[PDB]
Design an enzyme around this catalytic site. Structure first.
Site, mmCIF file in Angstrom:
data_model
loop_
_atom_site.group_PDB
_atom_site.id
_atom_site.type_symbol
_atom_site.label_atom_id
_atom_site.label_comp_id
_atom_site.label_asym_id
_atom_site.label_seq_id
_atom_site.Cartn_x
_atom_site.Cartn_y
_atom_site.Cartn_z
ATOM 1 N N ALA B 247 36.189 47.208 40.083
ATOM 2 C CA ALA B 247 35.279 46.523 40.984
ATOM 3 C C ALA B 247 34.156 46.927 40.154
ATOM 4 O O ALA B 247 32.959 45.713 40.765
ATOM 5 C CB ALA B 247 34.677 47.313 42.322
ATOM 6 N N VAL B 296 30.816 40.069 38.924
ATOM 7 C CA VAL B 296 31.334 41.038 40.331
ATOM 8 C C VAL B 296 30.954 40.409 41.682
ATOM 9 O O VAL B 296 29.827 40.070 41.697
ATOM 10 C CB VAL B 296 31.902 42.152 40.324
ATOM 11 C CG1 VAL B 296 31.450 43.009 39.260
ATOM 12 C CG2 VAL B 296 29.925 42.330 40.991
ATOM 13 N N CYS B 302 37.140 37.567 45.424
ATOM 14 C CA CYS B 302 36.173 38.643 45.229
ATOM 15 C C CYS B 302 35.698 38.103 47.152
ATOM 16 O O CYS B 302 35.412 37.606 46.944
ATOM 17 C CB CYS B 302 35.109 38.564 44.447
ATOM 18 S SG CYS B 302 34.124 39.963 44.476
HETATM 19 N N1 LIG Z 1 35.816 43.182 43.779
HETATM 20 C C1 LIG Z 1 36.978 42.087 44.038
HETATM 21 N N2 LIG Z 1 36.845 41.423 42.687
HETATM 22 C C2 LIG Z 1 38.231 40.967 43.128
HETATM 23 C C3 LIG Z 1 39.208 40.775 44.090
HETATM 24 N N3 LIG Z 1 40.344 39.990 43.433
HETATM 25 C C4 LIG Z 1 39.960 39.244 42.282
HETATM 26 N N4 LIG Z 1 38.188 39.691 42.136
HETATM 27 C C5 LIG Z 1 37.670 40.103 40.801
HETATM 28 O O1 LIG Z 1 37.692 38.240 40.632
HETATM 29 C C6 LIG Z 1 38.409 37.827 39.533
HETATM 30 C C7 LIG Z 1 39.314 36.454 39.715
HETATM 31 O O2 LIG Z 1 37.979 35.342 40.532
HETATM 32 P P1 LIG Z 1 38.370 33.412 39.701
HETATM 33 O O3 LIG Z 1 38.169 33.803 38.971
HETATM 34 O O4 LIG Z 1 40.045 33.693 40.184
HETATM 35 O O5 LIG Z 1 37.462 33.519 41.072
HETATM 36 C C8 LIG Z 1 39.152 38.627 39.293
HETATM 37 O O6 LIG Z 1 39.096 38.866 37.639
HETATM 38 C C9 LIG Z 1 38.512 40.434 39.892
HETATM 39 O O7 LIG Z 1 37.385 40.239 38.778
HETATM 40 C C10 LIG Z 1 38.861 41.863 45.101
HETATM 41 O O8 LIG Z 1 39.248 42.238 46.434
HETATM 42 N N5 LIG Z 1 37.494 42.692 45.252
#
Ligand SMILES: Nc1nc2c(ncn2[C@@H]2O[C@H](COP(=O)(O)O)[C@@H](O)[C@H]2O)c(=O)[nH]1
Ligand SMILES: Nc1nc2c(ncn2[C@@H]2O[C@H](COP(=O)(O)O)[C@@H](O)[C@H]2O)c(=O)[nH]1
Ligand SMILES: Nc1nc2c(ncn2[C@@H]2O[C@H](COP(=O)(O)O)[C@@H](O)[C@H]2O)c(=O)[nH]1
Ligand SMILES: Nc1nc2c(ncn2[C@@H]2O[C@H](COP(=O)(O)O)[C@@H](O)[C@H]2O)c(=O)[nH]1
Ligand SMILES: Nc1nc2c(ncn2[C@@H]2O[C@H](COP(=O)(O)O)[C@@H](O)[C@H]2O)c(=O)[nH]1
Ligand SMILES: Nc1nc2c(ncn2[C@@H]2O[C@H](COP(=O)(O)O)[C@@H](O)[C@H]2O)c(=O)[nH]1
Lengths: 467, 467, 467
Positions: B247, B296, B302
């Site tokens: 994270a 992040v 997230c």
């Molecule tokens: N802090 C946090 N980051 C997350 C979580 N789930 C995914 N992420 C972050 O968000 C990325 C995916 O988001 P996306 O690219 O689909 O918008 C992941 O590779 C990871 O870096 C979570 O529950 N908590």
């Protein structure tokens, strides 16, 4: 007809009001009973498509004739079109259905609109009389709507010469991803398209044919104008069966028309209607009619019940008229009030030698109408009544007559999302009728009439069973 | 990066906030540009599936590797399963996709549930290692759900030996009603299934392979526990690329883990993240990391932005970190905030050598999840965040730690009713990126970064164009 | 362009982002300003219908040409159809609109479908070249849909010979219940139909004509293939204006095509696009182009913004390109991002000599599309993008190219339930532009550009005023 002990109501019976009690049965399976009619119309199934301009066309004519049923052409049609339709129907293969022939220069929109003309679900792209490709709802989708059909990604088809037994086309199409198969003539030219379920039906159903082995067809004539000349001309046009239809079949004009047609000595069976009384049936029989159509008001497109209060519950009328005709030796086909196969089964149970369906076939792929789509994408079609076409008739006179004329009623007849074709609904009707014979235990329709036990059913009784 | 004259905002840039101005172009067509990455991960397309337990599986691994992209296995998985997945992926044909193998004793329900595991739309019924039938959504429907697959009306398939050029399988499947084709080994055993669009992609995409010509795969490791031992064990398990994900990638634990893995001298490229600051990227580079993941908070799964207010607009973070890494010689893959192919195109425009998609692939046929159906019958799948799996860690201690742990966020990622497979969405992303290169006029990704002209875009600007 | 004191944003301006500050005005009324363009296209209004296959047809061509605007024919059309459309347009009366000619043998359904082809609201039933009746939505309703038009209760029309001043046709139609009037040739044959609002417009608008006094027309050509031969052939076909259109107008292929067309010495003005950069406009000017189209991405049918992130806010691009062209002496027409007449007014305010509307005219009676009806009975039409038609290009190659090609976007462009015709929306646009000149106080478009005072507008600012 046989009636259950203690059933002496002070009220008539309609299809909504009746049920049949099963009896001691010796018929093992539904396939052991034959649906051949005794009325002389030569239909191996008791189903005839009504004389609707929106439901009776060449496609329904050929399909239902190949399935064993007669089709009555609607009245008020130019005899040139009648002759064209008759010639088209008489030139159809006894087993193979005529597909949607597509020229290579047709557009994608035209192909898509034509694909729903038949129940096969696929259309044949034919070049120089030889089939070169197959189209369906899959390859048609996505491609530009006004692009040519030559670049619609024609698919492969199962090709067999004409004359192979339905077993061969069936097991050849057992593992075919496409249900349809191109039936090809020995010279290589396209002769038709036969389907897997069509192969199945080729043994169950025996097509209704005349003395020359051609798909039987029927037409309807009114009473206004010279009935004799029109009937003779349509008979020379090739119509196997002649039908005289009107809103009120008990008027003196009906009697005069029936007398004239009988004196014509055309040789075709005589059909008149509709009357919901025994005395009307006797008068029509004495006028020179072999077949009496029954039912005014129960018709789903009929409005006279709400406008005038006239009519009769269909089942009591049909059973009474059938009893009267059998006492006079005539035969009767029930007309109107048909929405479920149970309606047909009861109509034969009442004693009718044949049945008239009406607006139910308006919800078919092959009906002569436009298959438009709603928001829920459910296919459906509009059913119209004839109104003045079944009524006895300058701009002043025309408008004055039309002012009092009942309007052309319109309904939304929904298509089955899966079993939208006329073939499978006809299968459902035939299966229901065969089940009725098995429950009664009758080997044929006359035995069905003789051995049936009939009860009265109320509104609360229909809550029994799955809707 | 190049910036438009007069564009000096006092605010950061995200994907929602940026657009690229096209420049003088010499690239004729989109196919004239190559998407080969410079980061050393050996992916011919700048797309990597995130380390999601709901989105990263063996099916996505093999599919995306054959399409030219790396796949990072999620952390907190038993190394036995990791080794099994790696062995499965390394044993995949370089061109043909592995189909849904169906034993003849499987039920109709199991076949229907497995049919949506892949984007082919059809599953192969294989007996004694030889394919004997084909199933799809058509023949499966209507038949009893717990009946065997031996009576599901297996269809015919196009059979070709392995080794035929994609041209031959393409024109052999030009008129095939079924898009898929069974790729058969010379001995007759089934080797795979190749599709029409798969045949098309076989020339456009070049699969990402290691030195031994096998589908590349990657895995993710955390910081809690012995990072060195786990990384060494996964490297011996056959993982081509090692990723350290957490994270907060700027903590001292991250630096210690990166130092330990670098001292291990495993030989694989080093991936760490995520940091949204230049100083964090420099610290990670100095710790012994070759690749720095950035982002992040912008991640669709997230939650820390809403819970704590932490994060950063993705585009400014990625461009700053890419500039810093290129000044230090390192390379960066953007992570988070990806919902449209324009997001990917801007991520490469900012300077990222590769992109991390995340939850977008949760809406795919091949994602390791359950494809459930809503009322409108629209397919979709649920995307989950790792939460504590990317966070640094008795029943008392476990529950006390879990009380403050952020909950596993859940979203409904809708499937495209037509282009539901991962293949066609990947095609859309690649087409968008190629269009971006053509508009810029760059022959490769480094030229795309060098020659791009970058502007700032507001909320009202997105009203331009078709949504 | 003039900018308000203290307005130095670090961001571009789109139509959503700008407003014009009214200044000291000497123009009394809106009718005191002329909208004649300086670009040399010879249009008396700054409105041109885009090169849409769904929006640019012979009906729009003739209507807009009579209203004073140029119409660009879409590319990728067989030159036979182009020549037919050009000959049809050049054979139109300078004042009277061509009505919906109806043969007496047409059906009621065909008449109803054709009635919405034009904005007149009525169609002329013409027999042997002489108008014999009038039909509308009133008499058509209720009558059978496939009945002939000879019994649709033809109404009476106001007949006048060709040559009467618009005053005479206006006051003759002051108390006419039907807005339309049949304009008859001296020999008695039908020459056209002129409407009350058409009579009003006959004085306000001056039709755009060539040196021979015929309705001007334009056509569009791509860059794939021999651009010179196609341009020369279309010029010989009778097209007054030649337009070279592509998705990216800054590529070397664009420069080569412009150079070839300029070397052809065809004599028609040169139109190229689209580029959203000043340098692209200078390159196009140096390549031998007189007119530069600007705008890629803001187009309502353009998808590249969401797929790739490319584009630019329209207003800043148009103003910069107009300044650059005026520095080089060239002229620019804004393209894309037009949904309200304020968009057009700002486009001329930015400095554009003419405007390209695009998908807005898809919601018109005269657009070459199908006017289908929804549940709420609101008329509307579908607007399509060209996609590959504006992009530079065996079955394998075709499918491989089409896989990466952006899909044909579809939108539902609603018709105004009352002002559905192209005439009244054009009136609204012209009234808005004239009001803009009156607020600025300019007697013509060059004075509008010179004397305009321009401000920046945010999202919250649009909440001011009635939506
Ligand atoms: N802090 C946090 N980051 C997350 C979580 N789930 C995914 N992420 C972050 O968000 C990325 C995916 O988001 P996306 O690219 O689909 O918008 C992941 O590779 C990871 O870096 C979570 O529950 N908590
Ligand atoms: N091209 C083509 N049109 C057909 C075919 N079958 C029916 N049609 C269309 O349908 C019309 C007749 O409709 P029907 O009366 O059969 O419902 C024909 O005049 C023709 O326009 C066919 O096989 N090919
Ligand atoms: N009086 C009257 N009867 C109609 C009309 N349309 C259909 N019918 C009758 O109703 C029958 C069809 O009804 P169905 O059997 O579909 O319920 C027709 O065969 C005809 O006898 C109509 O407009 N008026
Ligand atoms: N019978 C059968 N099951 C499969 C096949 N591919 C995947 N599965 C099922 O899917 C599981 C793994 O799911 P995955 O991790 O690939 O999403 C397997 O354990 C098995 O139950 C196949 O080809 N045949
Ligand atoms: N009968 C008739 N058809 C017309 C008339 N104007 C347009 N059409 C129909 O519209 C077609 C052309 O559509 P457009 O390209 O003008 O939108 C013609 O080929 C014809 O079918 C007219 O005045 N009379
Ligand atoms: N790239 C691209 N531009 C399009 C497409 N369709 C229309 N456009 C552009 O957008 C303009 C019309 O947009 P509008 O002015 O209606 O907002 C067209 O003249 C053309 O420049 C498409 O499919 N792709």
């Amino acid at each position: 007809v046989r009636f259950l002990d203690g059933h002496t109501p002070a009220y008539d019976l309609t299809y909504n009001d009746v049920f049949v009690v099963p009896g001691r049965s010796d018929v093992a399976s539904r396939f052991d009973v034959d649906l051949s009619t005794v009325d002389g119309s030569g239909t191996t199934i008791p189903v005839v498509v009504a004389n609707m301009t929106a439901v009776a066309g060449r496609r329904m004519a050929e399909t239902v004739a190949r399935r064993g049923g007669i089709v009555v052409l609607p009245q008020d049609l130019p005899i040139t079109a009648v002759s064209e339709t008759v010639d088209f129907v008489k030139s159809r293969d006894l087993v193979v259905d005529t597909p949607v022939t597509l020229s290579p220069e047709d557009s994608v929109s035209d192909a898509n609109a034509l694909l729903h003309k038949r129940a096969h679900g696929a259309a044949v792209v034919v070049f120089e009389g030889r089939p070169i490709g197959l189209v369906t709802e899959a390859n048609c989708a996505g491609v530009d709507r006004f692009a040519r059909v030559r670049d619609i990604a024609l698919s492969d088809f199962v090709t067999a010469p004409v004359g192979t037994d339905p077993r061969e086309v069936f097991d050849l199409l057992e593992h075919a991803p496409i249900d349809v198969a191109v039936m090809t003539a020995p010279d290589g030219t396209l002769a038709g398209v036969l389907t897997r379920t069509g192969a199945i039906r080729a043994g169950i159903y025996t097509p209704a044919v005349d003395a020359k082995g051609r798909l039987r067809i029927a037409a309807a004539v009114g009473i206004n104008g010279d009935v004799g000349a029109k009937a003779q001309a349509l008979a020379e046009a090739g119509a196997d069966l002649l039908v005289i239809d009107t809103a009120h079949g008990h008027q003196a004009k009906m009697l005069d028309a029936i007398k004239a047609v009988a004196s014509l000595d055309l040789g075709l069976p005589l059909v008149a209607g509709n009357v919901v009384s025994a005395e009307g049936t006797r008068d029509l029989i004495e006028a020179g009619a072999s077949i009496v159509k029954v039912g005014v008001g129960p018709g789903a497109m009929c409005t006279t019940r709400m406008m005038t209060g006239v009519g009769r519950p269909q089942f009591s009328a049909v059973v009474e008229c059938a009893a009267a005709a059998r006492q006079l030796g005539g035969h009767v086909w029930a007309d109107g009030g048909v929405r479920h196969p149970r309606d047909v089964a009861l109509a034969l149970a009442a004693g009718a030698s044949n049945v008239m369906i009406g607006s139910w076939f308006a919800g078919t792929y092959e009906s002569p109408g436009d298959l438009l789509f709603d928001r829920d994408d459910r296919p459906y079609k509009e059913s119209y009544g004839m109104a003045s076409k079944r009524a006895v008739a300058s701009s002043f006179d025309r408008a004055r007559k039309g002012l009092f004329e009942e309007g052309i009623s319109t309904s939304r007849m929904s298509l089955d999302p899966a079993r939208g074709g006329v073939e499978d609904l006809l299968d459902h009707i035939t299966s229901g009728v065969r089940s009725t014979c098995t429950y009664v235990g009758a080997a044929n329709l006359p035995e069905l009439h003789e051995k049936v036990v009939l009860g009265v059913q109320s509104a609360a009784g229909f809550a029994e069973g799955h809707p």
